[PDB]
Write a protein that binds this ligand. Structure first.
Ligand SMILES: O=C(O)[C@H]1O[C@@H](O[C@H]2[C@H](O)[C@H](O)[C@H](O[C@H]3[C@H](O)[C@H](O)[C@H](O[C@H]4[C@H](O)[C@H](O)[C@H](O)O[C@@H]4C(=O)O)O[C@@H]3C(=O)O)O[C@@H]2C(=O)O)[C@@H](O)[C@@H](O)[C@@H]1O
Ligand SMILES: [Ca+2]
Ligand SMILES: [Ca+2]
Lengths: 726, 726
């Protein structure tokens, strides 16, 4: 029977009287603050269903969540948006610890940016318990807070040996968390990694899941992770804990996107076969292929020795790093044993074969692995060279044209599931970011508050074009959308801030300045001014900041007039300065050092300053800080080239005494710069083997770069060469 | 004529056509975001009035304010609430720097928690300019942000020599700022303090004005502060800058409340006569009567030598500190000069007369002063003892029973104005705090998010009574009201947190935990958990936290699991732990060290731990920090008696290497504790002559107390005695 319900109370009555075979039907509409406890007992061939009347037209908003409990249940056709769960998870396969759900299915459900507003209160979106449950054809996108998106729980035997099936799901874009805990899928936990889960994870599409280094974190036994697609995703499929796992038929399209892994092998009896990997640029534990060194003999929470890994019939095209025995050190002294790497195909366009060994690899028997002539080998036995021409098939995968060479690599029958073959047809897969300049151009004339008004009425992605004239700003400009402020004629538009802040970046705000000139002479004669800042509230979305062809002068009417000040727990997807000029500033340029509690949280992923001129700056050019020992993130990157810095950072209120102080930054590149009469660069290198290059610069009147290694000598590759000190 | 208006447009029209003698009447209701400019020109006896239709029914909310410009204006019957001023003031006697108001009157206006939500965005509530203005029968309560509540500016000679008159106002409870800049009334500034103001401040009631050390800051010449009543106010009447002032017929009822001043005499030609001071406990610069030493040569922003002070006919009853030549040091080297103290009456029942002289006091002649028999004299010439019996007259003041003795101290004619003779009779004077356990008792049972719902439905002041069982908590317990959580049988209610936060203290939230048992084993496996914390957003209300008979165990599933985490710019009125046990915690216990910018800002007024047990805490018992050189506040106060600390503070991530680290705390008492096998106590003494007592403790297996003095040698009194160091 069909049981249409239009109020929660009516839902409560229908649940009390549903029978095996009935459908409880939630009427089309918006159900705000609806905590669904769907607790019932269907039969094997007569389930009890909870469905939205029209998939796409039932929305659960506000503090809404779902919990299944009982057996033989089905939930379908709901959308969770505009809100966030009041509990630890949006969808849970249990009432609580006392009543689990088994033999139940959740299908065609959408969770779209149902993100907790506090970026670091932790939750998950899907939490699976019990046994023989299915989570299929669902759509999850835009999780911006701490916490893995979907987890299989194993906390009781009831939930173990579960044979859960997780298939045909759209695991859509997850922005960078800027901390640890941004996994998309976790199966089990270190404390239960020795139990057998038997989870099948098949035919899912992972579309730019960029939350952290582990996309999938396997932490239990005998799971099968097969036939998935990982598209431009920053991270890896990591067999972190647990033995006896099968990783087959997966496809990785990194497209050369920065920091794409990766199958990471740890522990024992893992089977890695018939996987196709292409365009992966990740390195170290994010490499395209990684066989770890273990710790012997601990201790569930530590990585154990790789033992009886079988690694066969994989294809690796333009994979920049294949790492054997990676992580080797005093704790990770257990090199691989009893393994086999057979019939793989490695093709690499830039000379090398990407392989690097960090310990004895005699524990891996290599046999019948093909690589291309130009690809210089790193291992003698097990790898031969040949002339390959790779040609793309109708399935989208590359293969040797020689039919002899097709006993190497993946089978020609691999059909990677398509992005349009997962999720729900009735909910659109969209781009997560508004592109700059994607809207309309809007002419703005000078005056009083004309910049304020043009912003309030612009639509997201528009471009404000400033005619010639002066622009006085006596109201703080708040940015809650993607906006470019361009000058019609470069340098002909002059903005005069009149308040302690000129531009506050808010949730959904992203800013490009292009050709503007800022004279801060008329700012409030007070200390602490911040020309540009994020909202001082905790944010929920990352933000983008580009500054091109712009000039910013006279931030000096009182002390500590900062150019950019990031708020606590804020995160810039990138901050980029280009062909811009700065003169006379009494405070710091970029304050990205706010996360002082040393948990691995940082404020920016890519800071880039190129072709720009900074003169008379009392504070630092950048204070960037990522404290602690976490190795789950990839940033910050700091890249600064072709700039001229004069009289920078000598100020007395600059306690760093540096013109750049980078603590915990993981990629540094300072090339072809001028550091005239300034304070020195200071690095404080931490965990994770950070890579630093400072080559080709002038240090006239500025001391030499200073390297403080707080974790020596743990792999930190620093190359400070090619500079001339005067 | 009466011009009733119902909209701002209709208000503008009524103002254009109004003439001397008319009344612009704002219609009853709520006027949101109404920035009122009331500029007009009345006549000496035909004023132009702006007034609410019914006093008590016209509300200006949101971003509203009031400016007065012209002459012979009157504003009356308005209530500012539910918002804050979008400029520098809520009420201002000027349009701007060049159009002021004179001969104008603000009367019967209420400002009630119209506080800017960001504690350290500074505004004032009332700003007077011009001449011959009046501010009377008003009601100001609940200003929670930096900035004097009301000031009289002398920016120009147009605003000097004003004879302004400020009378019959209720200056109601102002909470402890936790910082400099929480004065109630300021009359001038330092730079203008040599101009005469002739402002009269009379018949006002200051009720728990606890913003900072200065209740009133006089910084002008020839003002007259008389017939005011200061009730349980934690501050002083300070003659900061400016000469020729008279302080007379004032009444101070301290009621023995902590940190009650005080008339502080600085500068020249000050008359202090016929004031009644009783039950004042303040000391150093917040003493009941303070005669400062000055700076001799001799700028304006500098306290100048006391010269020709007249201090006569005052009555001081249980005034614990009367400090002569206070502040004497190398810069403040000019002792009082040409002054006189006559016919005062000191009656103290604590063995002493409370007098301390810190320098040569021959520049003060004493004549005909009386003291009770039991008080040990500190001066003999000009003082004479007698048998004194004090009876309380019907004006509420104590007078000698002997007629012979009535020529010392205050006149019997004084009539101190009551609390019910100020403000408006149509707006209530309520209590600023809800008392714990003032509400009703609500029984609670376990366990399906049972505690969360009991909190949702409770009313402020209520007492939840947890029946025996387990309370599994999957939602954050957010408190926006005063509330007690009691176990019906101590230790029989067990609370299992399952989130990174269990309890969030929000605005208006205040918590007592009595007899609860918390086991946190099931918290999320992630670093940085906090069992209890303030909101991470900006907090407007101070909070109170009391923890009794309660046990908190197993906060150790991952590193840095703190028990209490204070949020930036938050402030605890007190934190009180009594008879409680804590076990196995990897983070700190009380993180009260968040204000690292060294501006005088702190996080707690009283931290007290007593009769309690902590074992296996890797972080500190407390990290409480107040940096800089500000001397405007009174705390923190840290008191720890009769505890047993075991295996505390030795954790690798405790950068303090301390078990207790107090920087800038002003009163410290560690007595009869056991510090077994722990990191040491570490004091970092700052300014303010702080007082420290470490007596009777066993430091077994723990280094002795470290004491660092950032400012030796100041008056820092430190008494480390009677401890056993094994
Ligand atoms: O001389 C010494 O021994 C002692 O001097 C004491 O310092 C006093 C000064 O008398 C100052 O008054 C000061 O009060 C300041 C406020 O702190 C604040 O700076 C305020 O700011 C004004 C600003 O000056 C300007 O006029 C602007 O237009 O308005 C601002 C505003 O509304 O805040 O100005 C006050 C003023 O000038 O008095 O600090 C203290 C004071 O008593 O509060 C004493 O603090 C002691 O430490 C010295 O040893
Ligand atoms: Ca992690
Ligand atoms: Ca002050």
């Amino acid at each position: 029977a069909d049981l249409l319900v239009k109020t929660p109370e009516a839902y409560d009555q229908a649940l009390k009287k549903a029978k095996p075979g009935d459908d409880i039907i939630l009427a089309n509409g918006t159900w705000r603050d609806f905590e669904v406890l769907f607790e019932a007992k269907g039969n094997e061939n007569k389930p009890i269903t909870l469905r939205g009347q029209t998939p796409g037209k039932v929305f659960l908003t506000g503090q809404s969540n779902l919990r299944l409990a009982g057996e033989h249940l089905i939930v379908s056709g709901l959308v969770f948006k505009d809100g966030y769960t009041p509990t630890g998870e949006v969808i849970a396969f249990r009432r609580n610890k006392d009543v689990l759900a088994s033999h139940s299915r959740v299908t065609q459900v959408v969770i779209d940016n149902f993100s907790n507003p506090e970026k670091f209160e932790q939750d998950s979106w899907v939490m699976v318990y019990g046994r023989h449950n299915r989570f299929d054809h669902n759509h999850l996108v835009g999780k911006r807070n701490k916490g893995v998106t979907m987890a299989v729980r194993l906390t009781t035997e009831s939930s173990q040996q579960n044979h859960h099936r997780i298939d045909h799901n759209y695991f859509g874009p997850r922005p960078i968390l800027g901390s640890n805990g941004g996994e998309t899928l976790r199966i089990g936990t270190s404390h239960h990694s020795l139990t057998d889960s038997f989870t099948l994870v098949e035919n899912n599409y992972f579309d730019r899941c960029n939350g952290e280094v582990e996309i999938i974190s396997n932490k239990s036994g005998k799971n099968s992770i097969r036939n998935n697609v990982f598209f431009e995703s920053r991270g890896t499929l990591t067999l972190a804990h647990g033995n006896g796992n099968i990783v087959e038929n997966n496809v990785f399209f990194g497209n050369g996107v920065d920091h794409t892994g990766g199958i990471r092998v740890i522990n024992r009896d893992q089977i890695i076969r018939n996987n196709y990997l292409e365009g992966l640029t990740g390195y170290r534990f994010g490499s395209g292929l990684t066989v770890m060194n273990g710790v012997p003999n601990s201790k569930i929470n530590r990585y154990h020795q790789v033992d009886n890994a079988l690694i066969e019939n994989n294809t690796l095209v333009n994979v920049e790093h294949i790492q054997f025995a990676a992580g080797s050190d005093k704790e990770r002294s257990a090199a691989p044993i009893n393994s086999n790497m057979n019939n793989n195909l490695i093709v690499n366009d830039q000379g090398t074969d990407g392989i690097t060994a960090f310990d004895d690899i005699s524990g891996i028997k290599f046999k019948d692995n093909l690589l291309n002539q130009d690809a210089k080998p790193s291992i003698n036995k097990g790898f031969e060279q040949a002339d390959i021409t790779m040609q793309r098939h109708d399935n989208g995968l590359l293969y040797p044209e020689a039919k002899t060479q097709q006993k190497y690599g993946v089978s020609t029958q691999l059909e990677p599931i398509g992005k349009d073959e997962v999720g729900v047809s009735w909910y659109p897969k969209v781009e997560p970011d508004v592109a700059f300049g994607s809207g309309k151009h809007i002419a703005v004339s000078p005056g009083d508050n004309t910049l304020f008004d043009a912003i309030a009425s612009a639509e997201t992605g528009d471009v404000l074009v400033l005619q010639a004239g002066e622009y006085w700003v006596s109201k703080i400009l708040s940015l809650d959308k993607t906006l470019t402020i361009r000058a019609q004629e470069k340098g002909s538009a002059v903005i005069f801030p009149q308040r302690s802040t000129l531009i506050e970046i808010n949730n959904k705000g992203n800013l490009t300045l292009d050709g503007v000139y800022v004279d801060a002479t008329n700012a409030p004669d007070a200390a602490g001014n911040t020309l540009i800042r994020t909202t001082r509230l905790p944010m929920q979305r990352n933000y983008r900041l580009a500054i091109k062809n712009s000039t910013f002068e006279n931030l000096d009417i009182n002390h500590s007039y900062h150019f950019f000040d990031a708020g606590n727990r804020s995160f810039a997807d990138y901050i980029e300065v280009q062909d811009s000029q700065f003169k006379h500033i009494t405070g710091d340029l970029f304050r990205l050092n706010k996360e002082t509690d040393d948990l691995g949280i940082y404020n920016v992923e890519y800071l880039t300053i190129e072709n720009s001129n900074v003169s008379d700056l009392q504070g630092a050019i950048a204070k960037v800080y990522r404290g602690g020992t976490d190795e789950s993130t990839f940033g910050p990157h700091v890249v600064m080239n072709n700039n001229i810095f004069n009289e920078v950072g000598k100020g007395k209120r600059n306690k760093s005494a540096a013109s750049l102080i980078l603590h915990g930054t993981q990629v540094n590149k300072m090339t072809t710069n001028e550091f005239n009469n300034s304070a020195p660069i200071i690095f404080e290198l931490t965990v994770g083997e950070p890579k630093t290059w400072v080559t080709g610069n002038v240090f006239e009147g500025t001391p030499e770069p200073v390297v403080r290694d707080l974790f020596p000598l743990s792999g930190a590759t620093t190359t400070i060469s090619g500079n001339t000190v005067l």
